[PDB]
Structures are given as C-alpha cells and as structure tokens.
Design a protein around this ligand. Sequence first.
Ligand SMILES: [Ca+2]
Ligand SMILES: [Cl-]
Length: 258
Amino acid sequence: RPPSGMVRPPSSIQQQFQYSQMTGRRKALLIGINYIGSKNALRGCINDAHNIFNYLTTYCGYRPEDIVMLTDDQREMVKIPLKENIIRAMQWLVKDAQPNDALFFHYSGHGGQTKDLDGDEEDGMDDVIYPVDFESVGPLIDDTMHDIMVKSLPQGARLTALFDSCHSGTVLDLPYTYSTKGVIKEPKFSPADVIMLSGSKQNIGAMSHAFISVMTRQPQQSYLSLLQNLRNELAGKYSQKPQLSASHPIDVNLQFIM
Ligand SMILES: [Ca+2]
Ligand SMILES: [Cl-]
C-alpha cells in the first residue's frame, strides 16, 4: 500500500495552513470512561487508553510526564474523567501550542449527539461525548471541543485525535472528511495540522486497536495506505468505516508520520 515515491508533508505554508514536521513537543491526553456502577456501564474503554498510552510511549516516543490519563477507575479525583477534568485536561494539551508540535488526543467512552443536518444554534454541535458525571452535568458537545482543542492551535501544530466512540464522526467540528468508500471527501479556518480518526458516520474501541496494529505491523504508511489498512483491519470483525477528518485539505499521498 505505501506509495512508490512518498515525500513527507511539505515543510512550508500551503493553500491557508501549514503541516507539522512531527518533531516538536509530543504531548497526549487519553480518556477512557467505563461508567462503573451505572446502568449504562461499559467494558474495555479504560483498557483502550492504556493501550494507546503504552503504544505512544514505545513506538512513538511519548514521555509519560507529557501524558494525562483520565479514567474513572483511578483513585485521584483530579484524574477522574469528570467534565471539568476533561475540559481542564484539554486546555492543558493545547496550552503553549507552537508550530510543528505532535499533540495526541484519545477518547474511549459513550458517543451520542443532539442532531442537526448542519451546525448552527445547535451551532456545529451534533456529535457529543459523555463524561462520567454526564447524568448530572450534561454532555460535552462538538462545539466546545472545537473552541478548546482546535482554535488555540497556531499554524503548523499537529493535533492527532483518535475516537473509539460511536456517533463521533464530526466530533471535533472538522471541515473536511476523508473516507474509503470510493475515496470520499466531505466538506473560519485554522492553519493547524489537525487530523482525527473515527468510525462510521455498537462495538466501541475498535478504531484504536486497529490503529496500533496497523502502525505496529507496518510503520511506514501514507494517509491513503493508513485508511485502506484500517478498513481491512476493521471490515473483518467490526462493521464501520474509518473516517479521517481534518481542518485543512490533505493531499492524501503524503507521508503520514506520527
Ligand atoms: Ca459536527
Ligand atoms: Cl477495562
């Protein structure tokens, strides 16, 4: 699947945005909510963040002191994926964002929405995620995750998001979307290098596990080769398609470097 002559993303302003040369500060915010005790409880979501954590540390050079992990089985009330905890942790990831950084975000939990064909008044806020205290604080909507994690990024900074949740296809309000059903593309900008993986638009945690295994068993991939490999990796055991959303047009033949 890798192209014959694959040139890494061009290290210059394009047309308005700029990519990341994936060498700057490598931070990660990892969220796994299992909703223990509740009548809508889940299993494996906490284990998913662990999987992303140690993969990021081993094959991606992410130091643990740069990684915040919110999981509800922890003991530290600061690290329990409460809404204020999730929000504050998102502000930290994006804080001091500079060109060419390698931020990573991961979420494994409940996805849903308050729907609308396109976003206004229900401004952009169709997709949502549920903090562990969502029953008494409300969900964390599509728009707020844009204002926090995308806007405060300057030109050149890469945020690499990964959603294992369902109904989270446009959960970062990303303008562009790339799929692999005949190579689909599906359209206030930001020059940052924001990309995101998600499924379909309920078996959860499929998208992270396919990603580690696609990137462990073949570390050299293009934006294109990634999506076919994820589709073969998913279409066997899980019914959903990979969706790489983005904040800018991506010539998918470039080298995806994480
Ligand atoms: Ca949206
Ligand atoms: Cl678990």
